[PDB]
């Protein structure tokens, strides 16, 4: 259902919360009533409804297919690029990437999308990141592999790697320090 | 000078003395035996035996009163036949 401000800008009127319990109770009564088309029409008029893109398959000069994607953490950002067919090498900034992430955690990271759509070692990806810390700069190259991976996976396995989180841009940053306290949250120590 | 055991007498039934004690109490109660021996445990003055018997009488009047309304006035909680108006 439309909320009450909805309904009260579409009737240019001020209403009050019991109003408006009584008019949606009234539509769903008219909804349990086999509201036939001539009716479902009319109460479409007060309802509000409630997909990852897949990026386009180009080719380079020698016709090797492969998909583009990009994708940002904290302050990183990353630019993936996913072959079609590849032997699971990974270069980051023209490094490997077990040399370039010395640490097992950012490795798993990288590895996460393609083991989730079991798809490790059928996919060559350049990788090219900045900014941030190493923490970031993982999270930031393993969405731009999921997305730029999202091409050339199904669309279930899209849609799994959606409700996953392997698709969904991480909203986490770093909350600015407030004045008169030293952290985002942590207020100084209470002088008594 | 009566017939002994034929007063405040239960015949226990297949042993359950629980229910019978139950049954003779619920008697007792009834015919207010307990309310007698509990109120004559100590002497209540005459003027406050008739405080409290007109005090009893008008809540009872009161409580019977207002059960009555109360069930007449019941019928009406039935799920409004205007809604919407």
């Given at each position: 259902w439309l909320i009450k401000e909805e309904l009260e800008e579409m009737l240019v009127e001020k209403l009050s919360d019991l109003d408006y319990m009584q008019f949606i109770r009234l539509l769903e009564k008219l909804l349990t009533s086999q509201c036939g088309a001539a009716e479902e029409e009319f109460v479409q008029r007060f309802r509000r409804s409630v997909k990852q893109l897949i990026e386009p398959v180009q080719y380079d000069e020698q016709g090797m297919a492969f998909s583009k994607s990009e994708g940002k953490r904290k302050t990183a950002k990353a630019e993936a690029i996913v072959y079609?067919?590849?032997?699971g090498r990974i270069k980051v900034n023209g490094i490997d990437y077990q040399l370039y992430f010395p640490i097992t955690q950012d490795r798993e990271q990288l590895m996460f999308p393609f083991h989730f759509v079991d798809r490790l070692g059928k996919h060559d990806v350049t990788c090219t990141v900045s900014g941030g810390g190493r923490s970031a700069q993982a999270g930031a190259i393993r969405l731009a592999m999921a997305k730029a991976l999202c091409s050339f996976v199904t669309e279930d396995e899209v849609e799994w790697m959606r409700q996953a989180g392997l698709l969904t841009t991480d909203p986490r940053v770093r909350e600015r320090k407030k004045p008169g306290q030293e952290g985002a949250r942590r207020k100084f120590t209470w002088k008594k | 000078k009566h017939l002994k055991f034929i007063a405040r007498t239960v015949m226990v039934q297949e042993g359950n003395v629980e229910s019978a004690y139950r049954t003779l109490n619920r008697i007792l109660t009834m015919d207010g035996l307990i309310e007698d021996i509990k109120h004559r445990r100590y002497y209540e003055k005459p003027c406050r035996r008739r405080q409290r018997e007109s005090y009893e009488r008008c809540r009872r009047i009161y409580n019977m009163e207002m059960a009555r309304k109360i069930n007449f006035l019941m019928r009406k909680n039935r799920a409004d036949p205007w809604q919407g108006c």
């Open positions: 079609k067919h590849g032997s | -």
